[PDB]
Structures are given as C-alpha cells and as structure tokens.
Design a protein around this ligand. Structure first.
Ligand SMILES: COc1ccc(S(=O)(=O)N2CCOCC2)cc1NC(=O)c1[nH]c(C)c2c1CCCCC2=O
Length: 127
C-alpha cells in the first residue's frame, strides 16, 4: 500500500495573520523541539513504504508530524494558536496509539512532549 499524501501545508482560500502566539509556536516551541536529539523520527511524515509499516495508516487516520507543523506555521496556515497546539498533540497521540511502553520511540516522544509542555505553558498573551 502507498503512503497517503502528506497533510496540506497551505490553503490558498484561508485568511492569514501574524500573532505573537504564532511567532512563539514557530520560533520557540517548534524550534526547541526541532533541534532536540530525539526530533528526527518526528521531522517528517512516517514513510510507511520505505520503512515497511503497512499497518501504520490503517491505524493512524490523522497523521501529523513536526515537518508538517513547521511548514504550516511558515505558510501562515494557522489563524489560532489552538490549531497548531492540536497538531502537536495529534502527533504525540499517534505515537502512543501505534507503539508500546518500553519502545525507544515512546521514550523519545515522552521526552519531546515534556519539553513541548514546558514551552507551551509559557505561551504569551493573546492580542
Ligand atoms: C525504524 O524507524 C525508522 C528508521 C529510519 C528512519 S530515517 O529517519 O532514517 N528515514 C526517515 C525517512 O525515510 C527514510 C528513513 C526513520 C524511522 N522511523 C521514524 O521516523 C518513525 N517516526 C514515527 C513517529 C514512527 C517511526 C517508525 C516506528 C514506528 C512508527 C512510528 O511511530
């Protein structure tokens, strides 16, 4: 089976804005996770073809990854900070759905999620 197309990163029909919360999500939250030592499994969509995981997209129907989130922020895809925070949480939830306690990917996701929470708990004030 094929990979699905990656999630849309630009919608030409959506209005666009810059906010301090969106700046924080890209330049502080995403950036901090992007340069972490456990970021590499989460920097792009799971390639179930090359990795030979034919059941991944039978189990994961809302795939999400930091490469997609990064592009969404850079393309002003998100109007509300909540839309971006939901994508991060979907990415982590997918990991814990597909994988088991003691898996190396689970320990990596847990460390990244701890850091995500520390950064998102300092989300700046809304305009
Ligand atoms: C054995 O697994 C890999 C081996 C090499 C590479 S790779 O970085 O060398 N490379 C990626 C681009 O295609 C060429 C190979 C990646 C991965 N894997 C991931 O990235 C990844 N991420 C998640 C979220 C996941 C996974 C796979 C584990 C279970 C599902 C699962 O939850």
């Amino acid at each position: 089976s094929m990979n699905p197309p990656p999630p849309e990163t630009s919608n030409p029909n959506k209005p666009k804005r810059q906010t301090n919360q969106l700046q924080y999500l890209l330049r502080v939250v995403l950036k901090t996770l992007w340069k972490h030592q456990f970021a590499w499994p989460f920097q792009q969509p799971v390639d179930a073809v090359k990795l030979n995981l034919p059941d991944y997209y039978k189990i994961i129907k809302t795939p999400m990854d930091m490469g997609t989130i990064k592009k969404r922020l850079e393309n002003n895809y998100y109007w509300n900070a909540q839309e971006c925070i939901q994508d991060f949480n979907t990415m982590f939830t997918n990991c814990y759905i597909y994988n088991k306690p003691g898996d190396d990917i689970v320990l990596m996701a847990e460390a990244l999620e701890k850091l995500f929470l520390q950064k998102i708990n300092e989300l700046p004030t809304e305009e």
